């Protein structure tokens, strides 16, 4: 289905922002 | 010599005439009449419309008609790049005290060489990318409306352009630009509505495009032969944004990593983009407008690309013509014909009255856009390059050479006009983005190294720039010269050269010139730290007085934000990006 494909894409992207925020908190104090 | 053509009923004649009388009206009025202050919403909307020009409609619809949905990819890269203007390239011009990236590279490296070179590069990217593309888009609209050769059509688009400039014109811009853009987006929404009605909805477009192919598939000229169904039938994947990495027309890898290299250079370094971007009262205003302009990067996909596809379904014997004889008979070029998708759609769907308004407004825009770019190339040429060659200027004399430049670039663009016509198999999009993949990525490398490697000295930047032009020209010239041909008659240039996608060559030219910059850089003397403050990212919060590199040749500086409004703006960017990504995931 296409809307499953959309929710997969945004789920990956929120994980991507979580990797970025972990980098900013942990490796960029 | 015009009769019973869909523009020749006088509803539309009266409407076209009325609008080009009202634009000269605003202009003569304007002749006799005579950094901050723009707010989130207006400065977001100026970014949007900075890129909605008849050249965009032509090319993005055309490539829609040719390739399916994945040029829409283009636009959805744009909104991530505009965000990164609003967050990375907009603070730097605020901290440095500059406006132009030429002003930044004068403060950052120092010499007159890099200003000189980017100036000459900008002349070639207005002749290749702005002037010739705008002339061509006018020619197309006009042909589909009133059958006329390319040459006769540009004679006319330049006639009305000269009497735009001399009768007010660029003086009376703010009034005309606001009203042209309002009625382009209006017109575009109505015509989209009509396109989706005619195909029989959204379900109609999707159930009808993958069979929309032409009936004429044989050539009188043998050698061409019985044309293969690979070429004439639409691409088997043309409902998807993400294509094969190697056999895709617009490979995924390429779109991501390589449009950023090229779309980045457009949003970081355009005169209009940065001039409209630095009108906020604030970085918060800039950032929040740059969020709204993302929400306006998804409208084009419906407004521009899907109508190209409905132009293929409705009119396949013209838009999707394959045979070299039949293509010339319909669009004037053996190589293809998709370029006519959006103008053919305007002429043949929009009803009497409205039809003329939409043709008038798409034509008054190329009048404005040509007049803008003639003025801009004239200042740049008149100042940077003549002054250098002869700094003995009678300002009268200078104003001649200012006027004689515009003659030269009108002529060289019109000379170039048949290369733009059959450029990438008859795909204006691909030519624009291919010229910009051969010439931008060096400058992309030098600006992303200038701003994040403080070791990069002036020797570095210059030879990075010049070593990127030679690799880039070792493909841009060779390709526009051995011909590019098309699906039916493949090109001739070899694939040691023009095999790989142009966006993949942008990625390689980015990293290649980058390493030239780093290596020449580390074999010469460094720039001392004292004249680098609020130029590199390592030194933007320095608060230390610096002794400028342009100041050696001479003898709105706030990034404050309310943290409550800054939390608001960072939230709205992350919501917008999640919305964008879901729309991408849906059409992948
Ligand atoms: O066309 C506009 C829109 C003006 C506008 C302002 C406020 C608003 O609420 C709606 C519209 C515009 C702009 O906002 C900023 C610019 O710097 C230049 C603009 O004009 C032309 O935009 C063309 C594309 O539409 C471009 O090709 C051409 O060269 C350029 O002169
Ligand atoms: C699919 C196919 O074979 N198409 C044509 C065939 O109909 C025709 O008899 C022949 C004569 O030139 O050319 C080929």
Author numbering:
A (entry chain B): 28 to 56
B (entry chain A): 14 to 47, 59 to 579, 640 to 672
From the paper:
Human (h)SGLT1 and hSGLT2 are responsible for reabsorption of glucose in the proximal tubules after filtration through the glomerulus. SGLT2, a transmembrane protein with 14 helices and expressed specifically in the kidneys, has 60% sequence homology to SGLT1, which is also expressed in the small intestine. SGLT2 inhibitors that suppress glucose reabsorption and promote urinary excretion are considered a promising therapeutic tool to manage blood glucose levels in patients with type-2 diabetes. In this Article, we performed cryo-EM single-particle analyses to determine the structures of the genuine hSGLT2–MAP17 complexes with five inhibitors (canagliflozin, dapagliflozin, TA-1887, sotagliflozin and phlorizin).
Unexpectedly, phlorizin was found to bind to TM1, TM5 and TM8 in an inward-open structure, in contrast to the outward-facing structure that we observed for the gliflozins. This binding site is located near the Na2 site, where Na+ binds to the outward-facing structure. The glucose moiety of phlorizin is bound to the bending site of the intracellular side of TM1, whereas the aglycon moiety, connected to the glucose moiety via an ether bond, is surrounded by the side chain comprising A69, S70, A73 and S74 of TM1, D201 of TM5, and R300 of TM6, extending toward the lipid membrane. The ether bond is unique to phlorizin, whereas the central aromatic ring of the gliflozins connects directly to the glucose moiety, causing rigidity that prevents binding to the inward-open structure. Furthermore, the inward-open structure does not exhibit density for IL0 between TM0 and TM1. Phlorizin at up to 5,000 nM did not saturate the hSGLT2-expressing membrane; it exhibited biphasic kinetics, indicating that phlorizin has two binding sites on hSGLT2 (high- and low-affinity sites). In the phlorizin-bound inward-open structure, the extracellular-binding site is abolished, suggesting that phlorizin can bind to only one of the sites (extracellular or intracellular). Under the conditions of our cryo-EM analysis (no Na+ gradient and 500 μM phlorizin), phlorizin bound to the low-affinity intracellular site. We therefore believe that our cryo-EM analysis revealed binding from the intracellular side. After sodium and glucose are released, the transporter forms an inward-open structure and phlorizin and phloretin bind to this structure, inhibiting glucose transport.
